[PDB]
Write a protein that binds this ligand. Structure first.
Ligand code: HEM
Ligand code: HEM
Ligand code: HEM
Ligand code: HEM
Ligand code: K
Ligand code: K
Ligand code: NA
Ligand code: NA
Ligand code: NA
Ligand code: NA
Ligand code: NA
Ligand code: NA
Ligand code: NA
Lengths: 156, 156, 156, 156, 156, 156, 156
């Protein structure tokens, strides 16, 4: 079904953001596992998987709309060097992702692509849940102290 | 455990090949599903998942060896425009992948990294199984005709 | 129990025929599997196993009759280059096998070895069932066309 | 996938050794059953089946590598006349088999056919287990005496 | 259904042989049990039962053919004094039984009593299996020695 | 089966290393249990058991190769006085063990003892997994602090 | 709990005896398995495991009493060259072990370490049961003959 050209551009932009997140979260996950912080590693693995599922839905929508999904252009991964940096890197990425999602939804509404809007709203809900998680973890580091926070994430 | 610098370079090169294949196969899978060739779509999805699992093991090994996994540099995806081209694109990618795997195993043997060698041999066995599948499909197109071959891949 | 010398010769001849067929059908099976014609590969494997079972019973009977089973002399395998040739090669072998089975039964009847006759009759029934299968496949190639026939034998 | 010509020659040589062993062990099995030494008959049957399984894997690998499996040439079966001779005949065959397996592995390593090497290594491990069994039986004949050894192999 | 007079005579001759065997095997069974060779006793009991079942089928066939089954004339039991002689007595009886069975089958074929032939062929197969057992036991006495052979038949 | 003298010497050296580790890990396990650090005690017990299983396989291989397993020579146990020292003692032992394993594999490859090589490679994988565990624990002591690290290992 | 220094010395002496027995019995077990005497191999394996359990309890008691368990000073293994010698080696080791256990119990009683006495009494009961097993085996070799004794220990 012939989609709106700018909608497809927006969908490819969100897809690009999800592709960055998949790799960033997968690497952070395996870094945490390497360090023995297995609870963080497992949670971050599930965040990566959730981004993979969003990327799948975007690819499927783009193809239905007769566009070309762009899996070639990978933007900058924000890789941290320690737990605090990794959480903040994920939060920085998520804040950029939600800004782009909001702009995409505006355009979908303008051209009456209500189904693409609905898909993007669902993704935005998931990304805001991730922001909640990240903000909460950074707050816990301050409340319980870093050593305790890391201790609480050694075991699954 | 401090690994050999060139082994880590080889492991990152294999990882880069797996990252290309993940995206290439995932996109091909969703293209075939879009076209209603659901048996091809499902098989290619499983091929993509298999490459994800190999990428995971490479990342884990690189981190154990105190190297930095490179998920940032994504090489050229070989995306075809019809079934015949897509299968050949996958085969071309796989033949490059096995070349690099053999060169990596040579070096692991030379520096006595026998555990990395074993991991790479297991990946190589999977990639050769993929080559067998691809060669077989291209042969079947010749034996049964393209229209019958596609028909046989409509339903799961 | 001391058997008739010419009976034992006949049983060793039939055994020789079964040993050809085991290997011919096993190789044809694995050729079909290599080509992705898995329904033909599976059926042909079961034909090979059935011949293995006949060979076992012949070996056991020869030994009971105090003869020496000959598993050393392997006659000519008739290996085809494509599906049509392979089926016809199997049929040519089977027609020779049934000729020899009938001559063996004649001699068993003449010297009153009724138990060996019964064993050979059961083998003959199986070989005639295989001829039926082979004639039917060759006829189906004519009726549905080669490409359709092969397509129908891709999936098990 | 086009294999190395000498690798394929080596694989066909190992296949030829497996085909001898299939027939030698099957006949030895049925001889032991004929004599009422059913525990030896059963064990030797399982040795024959194991060689059949190796032969299958070799045939499959040769076909993948675009070679022609040779099931036509059958080398010399070493058939004993009593239990001690039959066990030594099996051992003699196995020692030749392991020599050829090592030479095939050397060549596979030299041309970087690491998957064929791994297959041959697995077969070699099975053959060394068979050697262990055979040496152990011959040793038990010495330790418990021939009559006791045979008595212990009457019943399954 | 009025049968052929000579067929009925042959069936009564075979029945007479089965009646000798029932009693000879039953007595041997109970002699072996009395001596504490319970494995021989149980096997010989099952041989006696098998002859009882053959006698039943012969009686049934004779009555159908409107003949008079002869259960009155019992021929000479071959009773041994020790295990070796008892086995040889059974073998001697079985070799007479198979000679008579072959002669009966010849006549059934001549007069086209194909159902009686088939019954007799099934009995003949059973009697040859018994010959196999007996020859095997006598061979095992030679291979493992009498004392070990008897030891192996103390316990069921 | 007559093995290579230097292979057997290497296998006995690896065996000697495993015998040190059994006792060192078992004592460290029971020291941690005595101190109430039951999670460390249990994990270290399982490390000891894993070394026992490796020692068993080496003994079995040496005997198969007609060598004399050396369980008499016990090298120096590295026993620590506190958790930090005990982990470093285990790591020091493991790094010696992997050096010896690589040297043994080199020699096995040179003389074509591919089955002994494969055994040693499997042991090497296990020992590298143990190095990963140890390096990770030492890293966690730095990241969460010694008191938290010990607290986290009080309860199973 | 501060234990008596001489008690701790006695406990380390008993521990040293158990450590010899662990290794002696494990090696004898694997020697019997290599020779095909699998019933002896299994039984001796269980004897080795039982000694491992006693060693564990001694280590635990030493640590509770604030002593240093000595797993370093391995005494002389008594390794036989055949079944008869191996059994007598085990018996010689056990007779030394019970002598030392009795001397340790005397001292525990004298200083009122009744819990250590009870542990040693339980170990002594186990060691006397092993003596019973060993004396019985040596007696059976005399009563049934060596070849029969070994035959009875081929199969588990
Ligand atoms: C285009 C990028 C990717 C896409 C679209 C994608 C898609 C998916 C999907 C749909 C699943 C199944 C999720 C579920 O329903 O449970 C999955 C699983 C998985 N992915 Fe990805 N993925 C991508 C990249 C990656 C990468 C780069 C890695 C690792 C470096 C990875 C690792 C995994 C793993 C380990 C699994 C679980 C596989 C299993 O054990 O079943 N993925 N992926
Ligand atoms: C090219 C030579 C042969 C090949 C490749 C071959 C292969 C096989 C295979 C793959 C199986 C199934 C094994 C399993 O996974 O359970 C099998 C079974 C068997 N084979 Fe063979 N075989 C060969 C020759 C023979 C010969 C020469 C005999 C006897 C004279 C024989 C007797 C049997 C029997 C009795 C079975 C068990 C069948 C059943 O009851 O299901 N085979 N063979
Ligand atoms: C010395 C003479 C015989 C003895 C001692 C004998 C003994 C036995 C015994 C102990 C049984 C098992 C009964 C049970 O516990 O259920 C049996 C079964 C049987 N007997 Fe006899 N028998 C003799 C003669 C015969 C004869 C002469 C015939 C037929 C003409 C015969 C036909 C049968 C049949 C048909 C069975 C059942 C077998 C089955 O289907 O399991 N018996 N006999
Ligand atoms: C200080 C010396 C040793 C101690 C304290 C020790 C302790 C133990 C313990 C407590 C068990 C578990 C027993 C149970 O409850 O089932 C065990 C199992 C075992 N031990 Fe030892 N052991 C020692 C030395 C050895 C040696 C030297 C070997 C072989 C060379 C060995 C081989 C084994 C094996 C194979 C198992 C069974 C493991 C399994 O499959 O679960 N042990 N040991
Ligand atoms: K805490
Ligand atoms: K005996
Ligand atoms: Na479509
Ligand atoms: Na193919
Ligand atoms: Na042995
Ligand atoms: Na009696
Ligand atoms: Na026989
Ligand atoms: Na304490
Ligand atoms: Na680490």
């Amino acid at each position: 079904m012939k989609g709106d050209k700018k909608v497809i551009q927006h969908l490819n932009k969100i897809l690009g953001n999800e592709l960055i997140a998949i790799n960033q979260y997968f690497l952070h996950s395996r870094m945490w596992n390497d360090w023995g912080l297995k609870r963080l590693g497992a949670h971050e693995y599930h965040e990566s998987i959730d981004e993979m599922k969003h990327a799948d839905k975007l690819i499927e929508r783009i193809l239905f709309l007769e566009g070309a999904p762009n899996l070639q252009d990978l933007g900058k991964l924000l890789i941290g060097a320690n737990t605090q940096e990794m959480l903040q890197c994920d939060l920085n990425l998520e804040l950029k992702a939600t800004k782009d999602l909001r702009e995409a939804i505006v355009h979908c509404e303008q051209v009456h692509d209500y189904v693409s809007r609905d898909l993007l709203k669902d993704i935005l809900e998931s990304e805001e849940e991730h922001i909640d998680y990240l903000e909460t973890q950074l707050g816990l580091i301050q409340k319980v102290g870093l050593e305790n926070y890391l201790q609480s994430h050694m075991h699954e």
